[PDB]
Swiss-Prot record, chain A:
Gene Ontology terms for molecular function: large ribosomal subunit rRNA binding; structural constituent of ribosome; zinc ion binding
Gene: RPL37A
Amino acids binding Zn(2+): 38, 41, 56, 59
GO biological process assignments: translation
Protein task: Component of the large ribosomal subunit. The ribosome is a large ribonucleoprotein complex responsible for the synthesis of proteins in the cell.
Family membership noted in the UniProt record: Belongs to the eukaryotic ribosomal protein eL43 family.
Entry keyword Zinc: yes
GO CC entries: cytosolic large ribosomal subunit
Entry keyword set: Cytoplasm, Metal-binding, Ribonucleoprotein, Ribosomal protein, Zinc, Zinc-finger
Organism (species): Oryctolagus cuniculus (Rabbit)
Protein name: Large ribosomal subunit protein eL43
UniProtKB/Swiss-Prot annotation, chain B:
Annotated organism of origin: Oryctolagus cuniculus
GO CC aspect terms: cytosolic large ribosomal subunit
Main function: Component of the large ribosomal subunit. The ribosome is a large ribonucleoprotein complex responsible for the synthesis of proteins in the cell.
Record-listed cross-link Glycyl lysine isopeptide (Lys-Gly) (interchain with G-Cter in SUMO2), residues: 3, 8
Modified residues annotated as N6-acetyllysine in this record: 8, 66
Protein name (record): Large ribosomal subunit protein eL38
Curated annotation (Swiss-Prot), chain C:
Disulfide cysteine pairs (residue numbers): none
UniProt KW keywords: Cytoplasm, Hydroxylation, Isopeptide bond, Ribonucleoprotein, Ribosomal protein, RNA-binding, rRNA-binding, Ubl conjugation
Encoding gene per record: RPL8
Lineage: Eukaryota, Metazoa, Chordata, Craniata, Vertebrata
One cellular component term from this protein's GO annotations in UniProt: cytosolic large ribosomal subunit
Protein name: Large ribosomal subunit protein uL2
Post-translational modification: The modification is impaired by hypoxia.
From Swiss-Prot, chain D:
Subcellular location: Cytoplasm, Cytosol; Cytoplasm; Endoplasmic reticulum
Assigned protein family: Belongs to the eukaryotic ribosomal protein eL34 family.
Statement: the UniProt record of this protein carries the keyword Ubl conjugation: yes
Gene this chain is encoded by: RPL34
Glycyl lysine isopeptide (Lys-Gly) (interchain with G-Cter in SUMO2) crosslink residues: 107
Protein source organism: Oryctolagus cuniculus (Rabbit)
Chain positions with N6-acetyllysine modification: 35, 42
GO cellular component: cytosol; endoplasmic reticulum; ribonucleoprotein complex; ribosome
Protein name, entry field: Large ribosomal subunit protein eL34
RNA sequence: CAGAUCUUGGUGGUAGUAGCAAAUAUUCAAACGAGAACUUUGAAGGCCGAAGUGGAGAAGGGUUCCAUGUGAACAGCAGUUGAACAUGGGUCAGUCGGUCCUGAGAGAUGGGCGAGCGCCGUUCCGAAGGGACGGGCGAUGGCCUCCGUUGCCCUCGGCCGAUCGAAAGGGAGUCGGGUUCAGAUCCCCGAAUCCGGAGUGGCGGAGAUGGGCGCCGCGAGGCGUCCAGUGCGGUAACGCGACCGAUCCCGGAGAAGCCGGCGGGAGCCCCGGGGAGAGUUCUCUUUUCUUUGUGAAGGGCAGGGCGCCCUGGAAUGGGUUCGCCCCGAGAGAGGGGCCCGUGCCUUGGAAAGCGUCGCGGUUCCGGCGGCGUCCGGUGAGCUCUCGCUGGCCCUUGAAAAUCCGGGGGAGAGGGUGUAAAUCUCGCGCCGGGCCGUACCCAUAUCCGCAGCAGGUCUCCAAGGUGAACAGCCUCUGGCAUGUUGGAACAAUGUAGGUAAGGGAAGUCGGCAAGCCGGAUCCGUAACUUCGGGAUAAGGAUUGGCUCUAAGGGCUGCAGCCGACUUAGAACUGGUGCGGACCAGGGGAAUCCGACUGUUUAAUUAAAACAAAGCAUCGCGAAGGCCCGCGGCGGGUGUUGACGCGAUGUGA
């Protein structure tokens, strides 16, 4: 953007705390504050009410999600493997 | 308090068995009677002094004090 | 749940001996939501966050909120981001070997429950607290140990 | 300009010590402590964000004198909802219920017909 | 005395920069200035729409310009809209010349073929 | 007894000495009086200047309260005065609080340990419900009509833990005027309330009063039959005045952080007209100053707000906020419903209150007569309060006592004039015990051995100036310079000022002092983690008065009228213009610590500790670590390797 060069969102941390700390935190401060798309009603209303808990806007649903996002790579691969074991068990 | 828009019902309260008194009050704009019943002050607001003086005599029972200024 | 990043799931169960409901609080397995129907017991087949006794599941059902002895109401591996992997059973003597978060391999007796799926609140330790005050606010909801 | 004084024993600020200003007949500005407002009943389904559009909202201890009719909608299975419940929860309690009972009948016929 | 001095200052004396301690943003804030401007311009455009002087497309393509304050003051807006309305009038008139000059020949052709089939 | 820094008691010299110096300040006349630098009245000049030297409270003090009288002792002088002394008097509550409940906790019997007073522990090792709708039997009281009471027999229940713990949390219900030598939301006057009572229903209203029938009848109703009657209306939101009901169940309210933004109501402030008293008049000034009101609870009305409804179906995408935001899950568009409702009308209600002119009682009077309490504006103002919408978290934001909504229908009730019912439908009868209730709330009623520049928790906050609760001055409200006056104006001091020339030469060191300082317009370096550095440095302007342009709404103009701010220009003063006030000295380097934070109360604010970041080490609860005199003791543990516990370093 015109107002900055490479601070992104963590400009609000002034000139303190270092450099790679702010680089390692900007990558997460955008994800946790973005609004995801509720895959239950389709609208753009998914938001973090605290650590690990995601809310929607209209369908009023609440889903336990990651601390900074809504699907950890671990969670999604575990769901896939759960599918692949139910398939094996139930033929 | 309460307001009574109806002369006959006002009279019915007047000849109930529990009104302590009735105060007649005059002013160049209006005349208002106030029956102090057991629990409420029932005010009647007559804006036509001729019908007001006819109602004054209409008020039947033995409690007619007091007339004010 | 204040002072823990693994948010709890409050569940309403019909009580099959009277006319009432019991409302429990499990450790929400990742990916469950409001308005899901959670299946608990011996014959409830594999689904996310649908607890069924270890030993009647295949090898690799990534569980969390495991038990320790049959009937503890769930003890092991329920903090934010953890899970325990069943390796293989011993059909007689009802021993199932689980691999625990710290690389341990414990021989847990079978027929003890475990919620299927990983713990919510995962990925929590990847963001530097970045400021003494924030660390203070973290520990002041748990215990007087921080400075 | 009149600086005023608390009329009761407290001299602190709290929630139970809350004030409104008014004028007597005798042209004097006085305090008047007010009854903190409350909320009308809400979603007995626990998902509808709204709060009920049918019922007087007053302190819950006031209800011992309020009229029956004023404290609930005229509908059945209502007066313990919120506007979104009063409408959509009461519709949902049917669009689920009747469909499910009928589908139970259908699948019972299916169990009989292998 | 204070009423006299306030009257004089209202007229404008005493208010040179020599008597202004504190920020210009403190004499009258940017936020309030912008509110005053924009709540006037939009109460203008809605009134236009009611009057039918401008329809939905003009109004809703003006409602982002007024927000990005390409336009500054009510008079600026008045001139600009009177001017675009003049330009739409120009486009309509110059389309009307087009359709007329079309149809003239497009049916002189029919009467021309009548003449041709009379001469042949 | 001469002694022991001897013990107790007593008295000198120092000595009429130190001293009665912190926060500007007093003066004239008079009265009482043997008596006035201080008491009181009257005047004048000053201060606290709404973050008060004001008007109230919580603790805490405990008669300091109030009247009178005394001035023997105290008030570091005096004193006719007091907070002193002595004698009298004062605290009125269903509605104000406590009591009521629970929080962090605390603490009992079961159990355990302990020589033992006892300790551990709070659902853990306990036969933990003394309750009840109802059926049956007995025993009764009226009038054992048929209702009331008791015992017995069933039938039903979670003991899911005694008890205490909040004059700031939760906790239903009182307001206005009047009164005292002191007490008022208490006493008086008036007008309302909440709960509990009436199980002899006190009254009216609802239940609910008919539909079909054959016959005397124009009709009306009628005779006898039967049958229905635990509400009505709107398509909807929900309305109407009430509209049967238990164990049981589901829910709701009680009951939720901080911060930004905006609107609506309110009080206050400001302005234009009135009126009514008063100030000024040496000239002016339709002038300047004070005043110019309606509670509780209702009944209605605007006024805000909705994620509430019905119709219809939107891309040429639209709606619209200060920002956002919402839309085939129904946009705009119309037609509605509800929630709040302090604002306005009226009931209270002008009789009361107030301000004025007047007459009596002339004394005590809640004395009596008059005329008034009127009409507009304004707003980014301030303070409350109400609401919408956002931002923040590895923090998510108290609990119960209490009251309420629905689901379900165990039961009840009647025979065509009527019952059981009535979550409060309107009236009417009756009750609400106990304790606190004065005063100060602080440079005088408290703690500091005091009438001590120390300390101690809150509400409310006018005008001007100016960004402003800054500093400066002034109104309502107080005050007599903070344990004394008088006359002098020497040295030293203490606190403030000023200076020719030179500018740190002084000194361990620019210690102290001094210079800059607000705005607006220009303008910017090294270096850098790219946001900073940064008000860098550096320069210019700044008064008064006279104008011009631009920036609005209400019924294309036309007409209506009002609030401030900006930009430019002319003229003017002994070159003066943030004119009191308010207000940053600056730069090039080195060392240490990353920064913010914290510490040696009473000599050490730092380079010390902390701190995020980094790295370790143990531990899969028959556990790691740890307390313990003791036990199935106890913490971390409402915990489980992204977790605990033990360390080192330190962006
Ligand atoms: Zn959604």
């Amino acid at each position: 953007a015109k107002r900055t060069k490479k601070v992104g969102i963590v400009g609000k941390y002034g000139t303190r705390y270092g450099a790679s700390l702010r680089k390692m935190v900007k990558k997460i401060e955008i994800s946790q504050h973005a609004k995801y798309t509720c895959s239950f009603c389709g609208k753009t209303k998914m938001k973090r009410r605290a650590v690990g808990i995601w809310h929607c806007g209209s369908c009023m649903k609440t889903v336990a999600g990651g601390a900074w996002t809504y699907n950890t790579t671990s969670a999604v691969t575990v769901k896939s493997a759960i599918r692949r074991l139910k398939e094996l068990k139930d033929q | 308090p309460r307001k009574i828009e109806e002369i006959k019902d006002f009279l019915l309260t007047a000849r109930r068995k529990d009104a302590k008194s009735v105060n007649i009050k005059k002013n160049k704009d209006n005349v208002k009677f106030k029956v102090r019943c057991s629990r409420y002050l029932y005010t009647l607001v007559i804006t036509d002094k001729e019908k007001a003086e006819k109602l004054k005599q209409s008020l039947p029972p033995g409690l007619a004090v007091k007339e004010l200024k | 749940d204040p002072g823990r990043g693994a948010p709890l799931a409050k569940v309403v169960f019909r009580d099959p001996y009277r006319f009432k409901k019991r409302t429990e609080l499990f450790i929400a397995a990742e990916g469950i939501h409001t308005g899901q129907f959670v299946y608990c017991g011996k014959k409830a087949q594999l689904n996310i966050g649908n607890v069924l006794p270890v030993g009647t599941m295949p090898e690799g059902t990534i569980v969390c909120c495991l038990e320790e002895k049959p009937g503890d109401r769930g003890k092991l591996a329920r903090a934010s981001g953890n899970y325990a992997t069943v390796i293989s059973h011993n059909p007689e003597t009802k021993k199932t070997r689980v691999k625990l978060p710290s690389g341990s391999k414990k021989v847990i007796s079978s027929a003890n429950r475990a919620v299927v799926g990983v713990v919510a609140g995962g990925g929590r330790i990847d963001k530097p607290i970045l400021k003494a005050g924030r660390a203070y606010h973290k520990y002041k909801a748990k215990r007087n140990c921080w400075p | 300009v009149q600086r005023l004084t608390y009329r009761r024993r407290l001299s602190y600020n709290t929630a139970s010590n809350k004030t409104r200003l008014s004028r007597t007949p005798g042209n004097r500005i006085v305090y008047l402590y007010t009854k903190k407002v409350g909320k009308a009943p809400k979603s007995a389904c626990g998902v509808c964000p709204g709060r009920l559009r049918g019922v007087r909202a007053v302190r819950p201890k006031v209800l011992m004198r309020l009229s029956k009719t004023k404290k609930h909608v005229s509908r059945a299975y209502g007066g313990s909802m919120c506007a979104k419940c009063v409408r959509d929860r009461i519709k949902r309690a049917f669009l689920i219920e009747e469909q499910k009972i009928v589908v139970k009948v259908l699948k019972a016929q299916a169990q009989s017909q292998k | 005395r204070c009423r006299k001095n306030t009257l004089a200052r209202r007229k404008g004396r005493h208010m040179g920069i020599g008597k202004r301690k504190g920020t210009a943003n403190a004499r009258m804030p940017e936020k309030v200035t912008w509110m005053r401007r924009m709540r006037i311009l939009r109460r203008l455009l809605r009134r236009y729409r009611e009057s039918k002087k401008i329809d939905r497309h003009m109004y809703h393509s003006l409602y982002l310009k007024v927000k990005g304050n390409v336009f500054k003051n009510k008079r600026i807006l008045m001139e600009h809209i009177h001017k675009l309305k003049a330009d739409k009038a120009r486009k309509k008139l110059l389309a009307d010349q087009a359709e007329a000059r079309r149809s003239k020949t497009k049916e002189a052709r029919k009467r021309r073929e009548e003449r041709l089939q009379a001469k042949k």
